[PDB]
Amino acid sequence: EDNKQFFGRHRWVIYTTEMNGKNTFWDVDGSMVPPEWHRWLHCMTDDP
Amino acid sequence: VSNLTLNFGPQHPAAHGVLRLVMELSGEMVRKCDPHIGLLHRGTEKLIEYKTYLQALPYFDRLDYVSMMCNEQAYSLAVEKLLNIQPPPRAQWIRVLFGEITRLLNHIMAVTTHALDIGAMTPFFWMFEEREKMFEFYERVSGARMHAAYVRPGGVHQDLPLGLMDDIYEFSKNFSLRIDELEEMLTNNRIWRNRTVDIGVVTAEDALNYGFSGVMLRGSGIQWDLRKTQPYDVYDQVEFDVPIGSRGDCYDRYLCRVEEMRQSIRIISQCLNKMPPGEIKVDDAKVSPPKRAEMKTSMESLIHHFKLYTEGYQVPPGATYTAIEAPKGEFGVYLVSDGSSRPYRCKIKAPGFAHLAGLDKMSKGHMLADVVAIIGTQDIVFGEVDR
Amino acid sequence: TSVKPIFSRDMNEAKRRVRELYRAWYREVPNTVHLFQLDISVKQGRDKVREMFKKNAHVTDPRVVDLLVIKGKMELEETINVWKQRTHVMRFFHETEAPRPKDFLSKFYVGHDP
Amino acid sequence: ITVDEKLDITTLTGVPEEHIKTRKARIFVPARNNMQSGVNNTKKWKMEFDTRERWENPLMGWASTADPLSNLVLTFSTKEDAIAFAEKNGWSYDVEERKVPKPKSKSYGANFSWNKRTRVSTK
Amino acid sequence: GVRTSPTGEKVTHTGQVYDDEDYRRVRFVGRQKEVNENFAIDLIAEQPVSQVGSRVISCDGGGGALGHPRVYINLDKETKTGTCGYCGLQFRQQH
Amino acid sequence: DIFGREDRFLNYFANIRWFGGVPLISLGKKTVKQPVYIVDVTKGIINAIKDPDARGKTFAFVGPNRYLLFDLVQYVFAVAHRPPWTTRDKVERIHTTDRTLPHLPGLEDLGVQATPLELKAIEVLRRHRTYRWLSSEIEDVQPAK
Amino acid sequence: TYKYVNLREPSMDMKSVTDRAAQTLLWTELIRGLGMTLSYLFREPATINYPFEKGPLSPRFRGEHALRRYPSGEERCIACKLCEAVCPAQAITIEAEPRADGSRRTTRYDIDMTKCIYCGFCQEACPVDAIVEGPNFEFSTETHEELLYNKEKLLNNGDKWEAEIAANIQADYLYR
Amino acid sequence: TRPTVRPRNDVAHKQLSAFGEYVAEILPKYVQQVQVSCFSELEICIHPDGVIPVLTFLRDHSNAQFKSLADLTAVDIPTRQNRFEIVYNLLSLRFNSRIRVKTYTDELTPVESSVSVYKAANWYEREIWDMFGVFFANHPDLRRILTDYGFEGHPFRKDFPLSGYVELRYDDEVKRVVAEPVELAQEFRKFDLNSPWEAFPAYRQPPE
Amino acid sequence: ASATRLIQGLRNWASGRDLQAKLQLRYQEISKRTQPPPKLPVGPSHRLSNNYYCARDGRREAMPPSIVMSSSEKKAVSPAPPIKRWELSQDEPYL
Amino acid sequence: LKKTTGLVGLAVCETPHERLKILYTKILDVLGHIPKNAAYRKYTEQITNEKLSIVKAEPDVKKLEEQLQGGQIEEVILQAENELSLARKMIQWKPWEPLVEEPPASQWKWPI
Amino acid sequence: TLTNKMAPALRKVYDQMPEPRYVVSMGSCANGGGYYHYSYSVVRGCDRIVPVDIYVPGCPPTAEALLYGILQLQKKIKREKRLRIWYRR
Ligand SMILES: CCCCCCCCCCCCCCCCCC(=O)OC[C@H](COP(=O)(O)OCCN)OC(=O)CCCCCCCCCCCCCCCCC
Ligand code: SF4
Ligand code: SF4
Ligand code: SF4
Ligand SMILES: [Zn+2]
């Protein structure tokens, strides 16, 4: 989460690897975020 | 013999909707053009007959998709008018606000895409960024991006989320600066101007017979407006002024769209200043559903909920024609109601369906390379024309 | 019983106009079947044309006849030009309609009250 | 104008496919749904069609058909208009006769009457 | 750990299990047959039997404005457990 | 030999015309052949599949009329005019000659119509300059038929 | 009121037409104005990296169709048919057989996400708020099959995230 | 009645009644029924002849202008000896008013060329022909708008079901799009939403 | 904006004055999210003792009156007085 | 004097007065050639004489436009033209004769 | 929305294309009929015309969602493994 320097690109993520004991890195896409981080990452709510 | 028969093309990179076209021409000059419309025709008016008023409303959203809250306002005003209801004041004000916001949308689109079609790859980008801010507003308001209704008969529902009008204000603050940036991007450009100057002019009475209603009549003489003459809601009160032009030249129509964007900024401003905190929906439980707190715990609210969804409110019989000012010009729906839940026969009026019928005369005097600009100049969506 | 007849007062001029129309079709069958590059022999196409005329042969009222003639000159007015692709002109022919059994115990044998 | 007076039955071939021969059309006045009491559903003649088969779709099982005319209904004011539209529009029809409640005499006092067998127990 | 068919299919909280004859079963070849592993009914008997020292009680079903609408259920008959029509969670009057 | 749009037979003959001009007819004649159009075949299969008493009965398909000699090659080469494989496996394949044995249920014994070569041949061939329908002068070998 | 443009007197007087021959001839307005207002380039563009960053949204946003259940899950759906009754695309299916306990739930509750226009009406009509439009837009199936949802898939969708939806509903129920 | 109800004005009501009455006085030939909606929109019924004369009038006469044609449409009503109501809906430019002109026809009886007054009527008439099938005498052109070229049957009229009688698909047999009798995956479930009790007492008709 | 020196002089020198609300909208003024939870008013009616639904109904009217229906030179009155012509706007007469 | 009128396709004629005089006298002649009962001649002749007198009064151009209540003078002239055309077109096909056949008499009841 | 009238032209546009090609169906309409799926002129799905790979629902699908669809198409391109089966092993 950025210092708030700017909107729209507020916050950002790295998905890393091994999720569900399946795939690998380089496969990054959506749905890698769990539900609550989906909420707070989309500007839905300002509270992590 | 000579002449030719040429045809359309499937898309420009920004293309909204596809027409065919058959132009019998002379050497690089079009003597006769005969647009084939009806290519994309989804048969809404037959569908609406099978679905109740509350159900058929998204059709009135997406028949003309670009300008949306306006069409919403048209159908809603129709059902209210025929149904003898008035929305509470705050509903009317919100409806005006998003009405002129939507007008800002459809105008900025029409202008920019009119550039991208002709050349000028960039202004499309600069301004549709701001348009993305606009949909950033809708997503808060109605809970979805574009087609989300947020308009009913008997007033809008689900009032603004707390803290929205701040964002509205903030966009409206510097939008003036940015649209002026477009005005330096164009308007004294020798290229764009010298491409569209005298192309596709119109005589005022001729426009009346051909039934053009919109920036057409605006930019060509014949001073007229529905907003001023037949105020359909509190949109009467706020002060502003419409532009005109004396050259009927298709350049006037452009500049008139611009100045209507600016005036739209005025109306948005004054609206933000005048907003009463009354309520959202009307208070009549049988026209519009109760909020859940009253729904639960109270019997009659529950019943009117359940039936008002299953069967839907019944509208007394009558024939109405309502007309509003939509960014493509005069838009309207003619409702025909058997005393019932469902409607019966409702034909929308597409300004594009009129304006498009004018290419025959308008394009008679200029070769096809500017028939491009002739089509694109009058705001038109082939999703709205067909229906 | 009053009426506002269209192009003809009596079935006479009706028969006249439909004769005209069939002349037009029998003119332009080869030009089209060659024009859209159909696989049908001109003879076959013409036979389907006269068939489509024969289907309606039992009509009497010359209002109806005249209106059907308007339909005909309208569709022919679309085929004389290119406005209709290979698709529809083929769509008069039915290749992809499965043959429908018209004999009883075959119908009964399958369709269960068609 | 030269109105050209003409006498023949009106028929239409400018309308859809061979369904006209096979299907019979039904005319009636729908009888009140009994589980409610009220007549406003009644008073208007209707036209619906002989129904046709429906099956369980192997992917889901929604009902499905080729019966384009299945879901139509046409409200008429008087039966003469039903037979008129059936004749004119070309496909065969069958009429059902309209029925009404039979006029009755209910006297509340007859609940309590002296020698008459009618008496309301519990009221 | 759902009850499993002799074929290996997992029956559902409304038993849908296909029959060995049915060809449609082939659509599950190579791809999973999805069913919620947590049944509903199994969570009804999970709940305790609430008791109230009053005669007639309410259920919002999880609090105001979120839940099912109010209904007052009658506990008069104590030889059975009076059940809400929405939640399904029983009530009794204590003795 | 099965005949159709994307098939490997008649299209092959259309594409063998290239350099050297020696597809076959080394010794000439000696080749009787009756290509059959594809939809007749596949309709054969579907009737065979949905019709009882098609089980346990072996039989073959026949080009109904044509039963051509190598005059085919110059025909299909004549119509449609003019613009990794294998050895005598392939050219001896296409050079194989017979209609074999008459008694086997041919076609109608499975109850389906047969298609002569001409029209469908036009359809699949296409090519040329496309601008003249003309005639094309059907081969009509039917030797000894 | 009417405020009109382009009706003006171009001055054919001197010192206007000076700058008119300069204007036509030397392209100053074109060059200066346009080339410079593009040389406006340096402002940091607005672009967002979608895998690693995501644009803004709203608590009322409409995702995919998760069913919900009570605490101690009851299958909050009562089967009352409303969500199916108001569906403007008609795409829903409900068949409800009273189950073992005597309470009523649905046997087959289906959706065609193809047909679904994502109204929000089925979110308003549900008396108990059984079905709610999800926050997550998670999609791009490889077959037209996969976009049709059983009651089961909708449940599992509801289990995958709730406290999500619980946060949204708990936020906005004051508006509805 | 003060809140929640549209306030109605009697000024426009009396005015429009006066104007329609006036039209009835000056055109006794074609005028049949002149009524005013209680929400104040004047609506005039016209015999299916004087459409050309009546509209030539309503474009001129200097006490009325109606320079602009708003929209042209029709409504398909069975039960009537004439199926259709051709509805001319006009816009008065000078006076701020709109009035409607209703005319009727059956299938066979044409309506004659409203083009010669309003150019805007050009496509509205064609669209009516294609989507309904009301023929228009000596229209400058008649073609198909909003439907397929080979398409047939005039869809909007209630004789024509929601879906069509055909569908499109493609198959490697013919290498072209084809047509087959309509087959739906889902039945288009039908609903009866009409409740009894006559919610509106005013509009009731006398029973017989 | 981000730290800019001499390029923001370029931009100040091309297109004129700027830096109020950088086009990107990225600097604060985001309202947080709902510091108070919303609570909404309720308009007319929603009150006992004032009203009966008959008075405030507003539907159930308007049977359209028919005139001249077939079944003192006066004034030749128009539909209404014409539109009083518009006037200019003192803010900008022209632009 | 003035300048190009606001309307795009309309000429500016420096002689409005006697132009209107001519046109209105024409409308009196032709409009008077109609049999005199029918309301059309009555009302049209009334308004025509009235507005004519309005022309007989104010000499100036602008205040004439003001009190006249029409549009800009050119628009008024045009509308007088169309008035005349409608007049003679109205001499043809005799609009004032009694009704042509009444409707089916069951037709116009809306609610069905 | 894909109407009957447009459909043939659509398949032609498909039909002159580089042989390796992919079709992404966007929007509830084209992906199986969407808000219409009924009446007549509209074709139901774009499968009935051309084969399809990535169905992205939404009405309209949020630009982010469409983009996620294109990315998932890329991840279908990864596993093509098209050539080593031309090696037939
Ligand atoms: C003292 C001793 C004697 C000294 C004598 C000295 C005399 C000097 C007098 C001036 C000299 C010439 C100045 C330049 C003239 C170039 C040609 C020209 O004038 O073009 C103008 C012309 C006008 O367009 P238009 O109005 O449509 O045409 C009129 C036709 N009736 O066309 C146009 O305006 C349109 C052209 C648009 C081209 C596309 C846009 C180009 C944008 C970039 C241009 C600048 C590039 C600079 C160079 C880059 C680095 C090399
Ligand atoms: S959002 Fe989808 S399921 Fe819900 S009512 Fe609309 S189309 Fe139906
Ligand atoms: S409205 Fe809610 S409880 Fe009723 S059937 Fe639909 S999902 Fe179930
Ligand atoms: S936004 Fe919705 S209605 Fe429009 S084309 Fe896309 S799916 Fe269809
Ligand atoms: Zn409960």
PDB file of C-alpha atoms in Angstrom, chain B residues 20 35-38 41 45-47 49-50 52 81 85-86 208-211 213 222 224 226 229-230 283 310-311 314-317 319-321 323 330 334 336 340-342 344-345 347-349 353 356-357 386-387, chain H residues 4-7 39 41 59 67-68 70-78 87 89 91 93 96-98 100 117-120 123-124 127 131-132 143 145-146 149 155-156 158 160-162 190-191 193-195 200 203:
ATOM      1  CA  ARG B  20     -24.066  -0.751 -44.793  1.00  0.00           C
ATOM      2  CA  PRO B  35     -27.913   4.156 -46.285  1.00  0.00           C
ATOM      3  CA  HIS B  36     -29.106   0.680 -45.383  1.00  0.00           C
ATOM      4  CA  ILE B  37     -30.152   0.801 -41.748  1.00  0.00           C
ATOM      5  CA  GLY B  38     -31.728  -2.017 -39.794  1.00  0.00           C
ATOM      6  CA  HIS B  41     -32.025  -4.563 -34.940  1.00  0.00           C
ATOM      7  CA  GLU B  45     -40.494  -3.002 -28.867  1.00  0.00           C
ATOM      8  CA  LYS B  46     -41.812  -6.518 -29.353  1.00  0.00           C
ATOM      9  CA  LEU B  47     -40.070  -7.609 -26.155  1.00  0.00           C
ATOM     10  CA  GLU B  49     -44.916  -5.889 -24.743  1.00  0.00           C
ATOM     11  CA  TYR B  50     -44.090  -9.110 -22.867  1.00  0.00           C
ATOM     12  CA  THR B  52     -43.858  -5.328 -17.015  1.00  0.00           C
ATOM     13  CA  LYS B  81     -46.963  11.342 -16.577  1.00  0.00           C
ATOM     14  CA  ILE B  85     -47.461  10.850  -9.936  1.00  0.00           C
ATOM     15  CA  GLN B  86     -44.862  13.404  -9.085  1.00  0.00           C
ATOM     16  CA  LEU B 208     -38.120  21.182 -39.979  1.00  0.00           C
ATOM     17  CA  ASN B 209     -39.693  19.113 -42.751  1.00  0.00           C
ATOM     18  CA  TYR B 210     -37.033  16.427 -42.363  1.00  0.00           C
ATOM     19  CA  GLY B 211     -37.797  16.578 -38.652  1.00  0.00           C
ATOM     20  CA  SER B 213     -34.365  17.801 -33.635  1.00  0.00           C
ATOM     21  CA  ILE B 222     -34.447  28.281 -36.031  1.00  0.00           C
ATOM     22  CA  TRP B 224     -35.630  26.089 -30.439  1.00  0.00           C
ATOM     23  CA  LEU B 226     -37.405  21.594 -25.302  1.00  0.00           C
ATOM     24  CA  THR B 229     -39.960  25.747 -23.871  1.00  0.00           C
ATOM     25  CA  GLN B 230     -41.437  22.600 -22.265  1.00  0.00           C
ATOM     26  CA  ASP B 283     -44.100   8.129  -0.820  1.00  0.00           C
ATOM     27  CA  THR B 310     -44.376 -10.314  -8.999  1.00  0.00           C
ATOM     28  CA  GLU B 311     -47.223  -8.488 -10.715  1.00  0.00           C
ATOM     29  CA  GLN B 314     -50.980  -1.375 -12.599  1.00  0.00           C
ATOM     30  CA  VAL B 315     -51.045   1.680 -14.869  1.00  0.00           C
ATOM     31  CA  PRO B 316     -54.389   3.151 -15.982  1.00  0.00           C
ATOM     32  CA  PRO B 317     -55.064   3.109 -19.718  1.00  0.00           C
ATOM     33  CA  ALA B 319     -51.851   7.128 -24.755  1.00  0.00           C
ATOM     34  CA  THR B 320     -48.939   9.423 -24.000  1.00  0.00           C
ATOM     35  CA  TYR B 321     -46.101  10.941 -25.950  1.00  0.00           C
ATOM     36  CA  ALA B 323     -40.291  14.111 -25.228  1.00  0.00           C
ATOM     37  CA  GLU B 330     -35.262  15.229 -28.947  1.00  0.00           C
ATOM     38  CA  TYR B 334     -45.022   6.804 -27.026  1.00  0.00           C
ATOM     39  CA  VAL B 336     -49.836   2.694 -24.956  1.00  0.00           C
ATOM     40  CA  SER B 340     -52.844  -3.658 -16.791  1.00  0.00           C
ATOM     41  CA  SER B 341     -49.428  -4.414 -15.374  1.00  0.00           C
ATOM     42  CA  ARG B 342     -47.534  -4.799 -18.657  1.00  0.00           C
ATOM     43  CA  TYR B 344     -48.816  -2.771 -24.681  1.00  0.00           C
ATOM     44  CA  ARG B 345     -47.191  -0.887 -27.545  1.00  0.00           C
ATOM     45  CA  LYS B 347     -42.372   3.005 -29.943  1.00  0.00           C
ATOM     46  CA  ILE B 348     -39.308   4.984 -28.991  1.00  0.00           C
ATOM     47  CA  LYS B 349     -38.195   7.864 -31.184  1.00  0.00           C
ATOM     48  CA  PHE B 353     -33.487   7.521 -37.071  1.00  0.00           C
ATOM     49  CA  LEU B 356     -29.925   9.465 -40.641  1.00  0.00           C
ATOM     50  CA  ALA B 357     -32.769   9.797 -43.144  1.00  0.00           C
ATOM     51  CA  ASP B 386     -32.598   0.596 -35.032  1.00  0.00           C
ATOM     52  CA  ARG B 387     -34.752  -0.608 -32.183  1.00  0.00           C
TER      53      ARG B 387
ATOM     54  CA  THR H   4     -47.046  12.835  -4.485  1.00  0.00           C
ATOM     55  CA  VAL H   5     -49.467  13.816  -7.266  1.00  0.00           C
ATOM     56  CA  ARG H   6     -48.751  15.711 -10.449  1.00  0.00           C
ATOM     57  CA  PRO H   7     -50.452  19.113 -10.256  1.00  0.00           C
ATOM     58  CA  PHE H  39     -52.948  15.165 -18.649  1.00  0.00           C
ATOM     59  CA  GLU H  41     -52.396  16.299 -24.825  1.00  0.00           C
ATOM     60  CA  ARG H  59     -48.596  22.398 -41.445  1.00  0.00           C
ATOM     61  CA  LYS H  67     -43.693  22.539 -38.753  1.00  0.00           C
ATOM     62  CA  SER H  68     -42.063  19.435 -37.257  1.00  0.00           C
ATOM     63  CA  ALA H  70     -42.461  14.245 -34.084  1.00  0.00           C
ATOM     64  CA  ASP H  71     -42.890  10.537 -34.780  1.00  0.00           C
ATOM     65  CA  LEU H  72     -44.985   8.286 -36.996  1.00  0.00           C
ATOM     66  CA  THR H  73     -46.085   4.920 -35.678  1.00  0.00           C
ATOM     67  CA  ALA H  74     -48.893   2.408 -35.486  1.00  0.00           C
ATOM     68  CA  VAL H  75     -50.531   0.056 -33.003  1.00  0.00           C
ATOM     69  CA  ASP H  76     -51.764  -3.415 -33.952  1.00  0.00           C
ATOM     70  CA  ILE H  77     -55.136  -4.014 -32.358  1.00  0.00           C
ATOM     71  CA  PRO H  78     -57.103  -7.153 -33.177  1.00  0.00           C
ATOM     72  CA  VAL H  87     -50.813   7.516 -35.410  1.00  0.00           C
ATOM     73  CA  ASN H  89     -47.833  12.735 -33.822  1.00  0.00           C
ATOM     74  CA  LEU H  91     -44.892  19.084 -32.929  1.00  0.00           C
ATOM     75  CA  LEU H  93     -42.886  24.863 -33.278  1.00  0.00           C
ATOM     76  CA  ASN H  96     -45.311  25.068 -27.673  1.00  0.00           C
ATOM     77  CA  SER H  97     -47.853  22.333 -28.209  1.00  0.00           C
ATOM     78  CA  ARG H  98     -48.186  18.806 -29.534  1.00  0.00           C
ATOM     79  CA  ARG H 100     -51.852  13.632 -32.212  1.00  0.00           C
ATOM     80  CA  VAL H 117     -46.108  17.119 -46.577  1.00  0.00           C
ATOM     81  CA  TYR H 118     -43.275  15.994 -44.293  1.00  0.00           C
ATOM     82  CA  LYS H 119     -39.992  14.641 -45.593  1.00  0.00           C
ATOM     83  CA  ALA H 120     -39.396  13.110 -42.157  1.00  0.00           C
ATOM     84  CA  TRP H 123     -38.451   6.300 -43.414  1.00  0.00           C
ATOM     85  CA  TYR H 124     -41.169   6.064 -40.749  1.00  0.00           C
ATOM     86  CA  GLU H 127     -40.378   0.994 -41.294  1.00  0.00           C
ATOM     87  CA  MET H 131     -42.572  -4.171 -39.499  1.00  0.00           C
ATOM     88  CA  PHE H 132     -46.370  -4.116 -39.981  1.00  0.00           C
ATOM     89  CA  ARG H 143     -37.928  -1.571 -49.033  1.00  0.00           C
ATOM     90  CA  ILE H 145     -35.906  -1.595 -42.752  1.00  0.00           C
ATOM     91  CA  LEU H 146     -35.030  -3.399 -39.489  1.00  0.00           C
ATOM     92  CA  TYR H 149     -33.712  -9.207 -46.775  1.00  0.00           C
ATOM     93  CA  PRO H 155     -42.956  -9.207 -37.139  1.00  0.00           C
ATOM     94  CA  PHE H 156     -44.482  -6.643 -34.769  1.00  0.00           C
ATOM     95  CA  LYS H 158     -49.396  -9.943 -32.785  1.00  0.00           C
ATOM     96  CA  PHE H 160     -46.235 -13.117 -35.227  1.00  0.00           C
ATOM     97  CA  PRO H 161     -44.870 -14.858 -32.111  1.00  0.00           C
ATOM     98  CA  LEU H 162     -42.055 -13.491 -29.987  1.00  0.00           C
ATOM     99  CA  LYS H 190     -44.981 -17.730 -19.885  1.00  0.00           C
ATOM    100  CA  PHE H 191     -46.425 -15.728 -17.002  1.00  0.00           C
ATOM    101  CA  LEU H 193     -49.460 -11.419 -14.276  1.00  0.00           C
ATOM    102  CA  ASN H 194     -52.972 -10.022 -14.706  1.00  0.00           C
ATOM    103  CA  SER H 195     -54.805  -9.908 -11.384  1.00  0.00           C
ATOM    104  CA  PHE H 200     -59.226   1.313 -11.717  1.00  0.00           C
ATOM    105  CA  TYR H 203     -62.352   3.207 -17.029  1.00  0.00           C
TER     106      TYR H 203
END
